[model samples]
Target: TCPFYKKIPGTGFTVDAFQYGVVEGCTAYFLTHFHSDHYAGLSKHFTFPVYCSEITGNLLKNKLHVQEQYIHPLPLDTECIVNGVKVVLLDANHCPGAVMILFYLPNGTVILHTGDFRADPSMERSLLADQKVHMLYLDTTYCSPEYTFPSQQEVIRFAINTAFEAVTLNPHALVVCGTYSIGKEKVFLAIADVLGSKVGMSQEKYKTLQCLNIPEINSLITTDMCSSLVHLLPMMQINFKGLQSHLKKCGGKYNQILAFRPTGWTHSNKFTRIADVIPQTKGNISIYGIPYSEHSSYLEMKRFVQWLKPQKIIPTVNVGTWKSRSTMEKYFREWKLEAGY
Candidate 1:
């Protein structure tokens, strides 16, 4: 959806758009997280200094191989002066190394850019509550009323149950999960321990997991392919045909592929009936599209916006078309909560 690059409001800094040609007078660059979408434009070289959280900076070095000297990592929940502006990085409840940025401009106005985040009660991060925000760059990924995914814990519980049922039904069933680089590790990690399946990973994938710093993960991850049963494949590679070939390759090692597709789009906000949660598969290679998103749900976003009530709100996602943008904006306009909470 990001056909155009995003620029930070006050400074000549651009956020998440190293792919587009550099902007004139753009004094700096900002990376919110290590996700491919956010870190798209960056390569082995760059012109301006890129500011990110410590973990994000590590990935840029280890994954993308961006120039180490130009990548300046800042500590979380602390004020740091970048060239001139006062800035702070707060933990983004999305991916590891992700952060919500707060910048103080020279005019005494403060701007908040929630790169991508979910609202958690643990998020009563008191420093944010103390400020009078001038403007807010929001992550409106699920701004519409049509989405209200269950809590992360609930989703993981359902995932475990789903896996249990799959394996119980067919002893030959081998559960495999599709995952993003950093996010959704919780789902597979939980599944691995509960199901007692060794996790398979490539050297490259394991390096990304190295960034997570999860205790006991060293015991869970196995580099040997056959030793690991609950495989973690990339999100896009889990189609029926692809799984068919993969299952063929491992013939006697695994007979059936029970794949879980974890994303936010599976759940609906409008469900009047009761048969919505279970997964009943029909074939040798079955996929359960589950709702396990890091982005805030509609209700959570509504609460966050009302609590922080910025002077203005800007939508980062689903803005490519007029219809989409206005529909998302209507959610804001219709809210009884005053924008300017």
Candidate 2:
């Protein structure tokens, strides 16, 4: 139910973009991240001044051909004034250069937009310890209780160890790690360092990562997949049948192709605490889905709401009138009612 734009109730600031049409009175646009879904209708013709992280601005320039003058880079943990409103950016912890936006309005109401973030204790010290947020624009991607999973660090460790295990058993094997355009760099880089091999990526992806200036990641990219044992493939390319077709094309050059998709969708219950490394094989291609996620689970969300105690919570996506009110009320009653916001 995501991939939608949001407008602050009484303000002219638009959050992200919508595919169908543009908001009428948008004065500024705030981009939380550079994910495709978050930046749907953004093009060279975009009129409003766009504000985002430095890395996100670089991607907009290199990949999307956005005009340089229209892009503004907001540094993390720094405060800036725009259009008479005090704005600050904080690390989102979802991906490199992702941020949560804080707007101190002229009305003395502080509004926070948690663009797309994983809940962390440090965020409290950075965002909630000092200011009382009046309106919270939340990332409710996994609002339901069924989305609980392990922490990001735990999943990264599991993915690296699993890749090592696979490649150690079969030296000639190909380790294909699935990742998004901007995320999962940690997983790929860790696998590369542990296996002592260079990771291969698409030319465009290599250029995108180059702008981040990560030395370990920059030293690992190769255009040719066959040149390296560890390959950083897009999430779309690491599917079961796709890898099988790729292996068939290679024709016995590799003994096996182990694919790892580190995502939170792999875990469905609380009993499974660690990463779900259940291997499923299809024609010599072993696939495992790791529980690495950047969004907060329902339990974590409850805790976050209790700690922050925002007066009103607004859903960023699929925000129907009744649906929004009902969802927020339910969570408030269940988690934050007696706690007092």
Candidate 3:
């Protein structure tokens, strides 16, 4: 497993001296977010201890449930020495525990590593004003100029409205809202706060929230939460047919079941059939979607790079042996390259 990309498009030296073979000169490695794409390698076989902000440590270790020994937490905005290098973390309001890491090197080089993050003004406005950046490894997951999304509040409204509709139609309905465990923690909190009620999750997921000491959640509380509402796994659409009869058999008349994430539908035409179970739907079932994304948009990424103005911008995601025609080319086809081109 390599820590950095293998080659640059226009230069001979790779992005950094990290590859499958042991890297000789790397002093410190910083992680900005807890997304699996950014931290998956660390779980398998990774060298060098991973460093993150104080808030991120538990999510990476206790929540994501990595391991205690590999993770080291630093304070937010406060500089810390690791492997004899200075680093700091800045808050990114994308996820519950996401951040953007700043790395300081002895050679007067400062690398700003941004894990996938949305350009929330409260988060990025201050960071973008910094002028000391020598290099930047940025996130640009949605690097196309046309990408757009509703505001967080708007998404929340959609989710809330849809949930209420289910309750009105079928007070006994078992509603399910589909979302990932980590990214959608806030959505759950919003639901919890409004309903003054909690939702049920598996033991593993509940442990993750508790290990991080997430104040929003308390326990599995399955019996009570499930009785009120159901948050289904986004990955279980195909099995809906198998479970549909079970829903009916459980005295589920006027009961509601909400499933989220159309992409998670494994079977074709699952949504249409599932809508039939809703008491009031005259072939008009509502599937609520919240376009809440953690990654930056193409316009957002372009703005961040132009604002920072790094000397040599190295794209961080999708690192591997394949060398793009150039550094910009590498990111051009991927994310975080709009400024380069």
Candidate 4:
């Protein structure tokens, strides 16, 4: 495990650091979102006081059966004291319960820990604009130049149009949407609503969605495969070999399969651009990798780093190994080098 990834400076709080068990450096745990990678190693047996947004707390409690007393559900944008650390939650825009945590510690130190975030210009209006944030715990998952991609809305728009045109031409073609446990839902949900196609997902995933309690999301889901043309499958199962099993499951109603895989790594390059995101086919199954990332792109990370200009920066991802950490450091150093640092 990476030492720096879970450690929050000037405090005893560990943000998204459960994998290492109880740390001597940490007394409390701060969960930024409900994603498994962030919440790894945490369970009902976890005795530490966990801090997160109210939405995330619900998921933690319902999903993992965590006790309510240990969960500190804080409201957004409000400052509250936890173990003498002044904490605040700002909407992360990455996922429903994701947040960029603000911690004001004793000795006048300020730490901004972004669990995972998608950046936008609207972030300039944040409370950090007026105050000087001393340290920044950044999400460096796609912080490299090669990981640059288009906006989420733009990508979603493109996918919607692609799926709409595909369905319009081939009315009987089944569209499969690839997804993870808790992210990339906006693309699938919007496409299903616009096309008036009910989405079919696993009973487990559907149950998790119901736990989220989104206003209109429940209306578009169905258990019967006959009514819904769009099927929601795990991210890895969208491939050609995987679609064969899907073809068998669909009975005889659909002859062709068109799949969309929405993920950050699919972007893969900067020069090729979003328009260059093309499709690949193997026999009757066609798969398209849609560059729909919940995390900030490289440009967004750069803009955010420059906007804050925090006195210190720490990376949260790819920090376990020396080379990976160096790559992260190299990227951060390049960003810092270009600026007035």
Candidate 5:
């Protein structure tokens, strides 16, 4: 067996440290997605240079305020050579501009690193690469098989239709959702997609939507301008103001406005506009639980390993293992995917 590099942190290393060590030796850090956990330790210590899709790079620099010096922006599926390592970025289908890394080493060793991805049959043309993957570092988040994740489109339909129905019933009400900007963007797109219009992106959304090749449907809006049909307001703007503001603008007990992306409910002083935030979203607005999760579920991991038929399967973003000194003892007993390092 060839000598594979082992990741080691200062003393104790979590998922965060595991990535940091990879960047140190690899000379380049390829971002799979812009989720908080995937880049858990990136902000702690800046490395040589980070490469990601243009949208990812801009969003990291703009929304997350990531350092520009270290951010090297690339397009989706662009093949290039860095530090003598052949790299190809593939669309992960998780979020806008999320990518999976494929490395072709000089010695003819091929490795595929999928941070947190799913096999979406819809984008088969893009994902079904010609190269035969050798060693795959997969997202073993869903090791079990019970977690049947719903598609992104279905989740969006439920979230939006519920919100629309709430307004249809009440007329004069406010909808507030607590999620990140990325999630909010998808929700916004869903609204437009349903309304038979293009999603209009604001200046603030550029960093996030810069890389996504959004579908040019009958009605999709990518500019900052809001039209008469669909109201174009910033996410924060809708969230900060309450229903009273909506009543003033679109009077008559039928002023339907949806406000999403609220922060600090448990610890922050902000309170829900509705008398009962929980136990009442069903009556007010739809509390969408779309499986737009960045992390893989426990079951998907197990199935992926079985498919790979790998000699050894390593868990990166899981419990019981430090960033460094990864123990190979915890193998999938059924598939025999775990072995000694």
Candidate 6:
């Protein structure tokens, strides 16, 4: 049941979005993060109360305008009870408010839903390590062995170095970094702090980042594009047409415009046809696909699974049928690991 909300066998609870129509008396609704894929089909029209982190709740309330009364913010690492089941929320380390949910079932089985997180060493020492996990809902976005990538810190460092080099080489040129609406704030924040320049973002992006209340990030954001030499534009804005429109508006104010894209796909040989970091330059724009990712790499995923030793393994994406699960398990065994512990 990857990519779909799953009901814990014994607990009367459900995690993530509920599809195929609601079930009567579904205990509580849990949203791990505000990613579009996770938040798909959820809207202001939702009736039941949705439970998530304080930041995610605010996004639901202010951004989506979901009814405040229907939104509940769960504090991180704090234990709460719903329908006699013990629930605890932990930091997912994916995005600003992303969380990993743990449910202590009545039968002594501990179910863990890692709602899209990078493996942090601190997390390995948290309350989750204190308990034996029974079932694990993994984020298998990069579950294949070919998806080896460096740490996010290293990637950000490289991106910062590259951007600084670009701007230093072309003093009057504008350097644009491409990112999602919310995911890649770390890249922009590092660029702003390192370059001593403001990051020009859309008002919507500004409001979203403001809600994070991150001290290092708040002061560096501005709505004016030309306010700073570096602009943090959305990933969708990195295309040729978009750059052409922007260049037309600039009207020779800058010698050139270069774009940098930070993503984990840079490590996928099948996709990029190259495993290492490679910078591609076409005409006035230069886009580099740095190995920046929030999800665990293939080796990291295997390590996480081996460390947890859950009774069953499940893939959370592109799971279309039962055989898909079987195929995932087969791959696990091929790697000299058992699927169901």
Query: For all candidates, what are the clash counts?
Result: 2, 0, 11, 0, 20, 0
Model 2 lDDT vs. the true structure? Answer: 0.78
- lDDT of model 4 at residue 339? 89
| Candidate 2 residue-wise lDDT, 1-341, digit = tens | 32333766556687775454666776788899988878898887776699999989988888888899999998888889877678898988888778888888888899899998887877778846887889888887777677777777787788788888878888888888887768767877888888988888778877888767576555778877767778776788888878877777555778799888877664344555565446778777888777777788877877887899888777775465677557656866776657865
Badly placed stretches (over 4 Å) of model 2 are 1-5, 18-22, 248-253, 266-276, 318-328
The candidate that wins on TM-score is 4
Across residues 80-123, which tens digit of lDDT does each residue of candidate 4 receive? 89888888899998888889999888888888988888888788
Better of 3 and 6 by TM-score: 6
Q: Please say which candidate is ahead in lDDT: 3 or 4.
A: 4
- Order the candidates by lDDT, highest first — what do you get? 4, 1, 2, 6, 3, 5
Worst 10 residues of 1 by lDDT: 266-275
Worst 10 residues of 6 by lDDT: 267-276
Whole-model lDDT for model 5 versus the true structure? Answer: 0.51
Q: Candidate 1, TM-score vs. the true structure?
A: 0.90
Task: Identify the leading candidate in terms of lDDT.
Answer: 4
Weakest 10 consecutive residues of candidate 5 by summed lDDT:
7-16
TM-score per candidate, in order?
0.90, 0.90, 0.73, 0.92, 0.62, 0.90
Residue 116 displacement in candidate 1 (angstroms): 1.3
Candidate 5 error regions (>4 Å): 1-26, 40-47, 64-70, 121-132, 181-184, 192-305, 321-333, 336-341
Q: Which 10 consecutive positions of candidate 3 have the poorest summed lDDT?
A: 7-16
Superposed on all Cα atoms, the candidates' RMSDs to the truth, in angstroms, are 2.7, 2.8, 6.5, 2.2, 8.2, 2.9
> Candidate 1, after superposition: displacement of residue 79 in Å?
1.2
Candidate 3 vs candidate 5: the TM-score winner is: 3
| lDDT tens digits, residue span 1-341, model 5 | 10132221121111223244453344455666677756655652464577777777766676666788888877666678766666777877566677766667776656666666765443345533465555666565544444445445555666677666655666454443343445335665566555554554445654455544556532455563333223445444443244345435544433444544422112211332222234223223323223444444444455444545544444544444453223323436645624221
Evaluation by TM-score, superior candidate among 2 and 5: 2
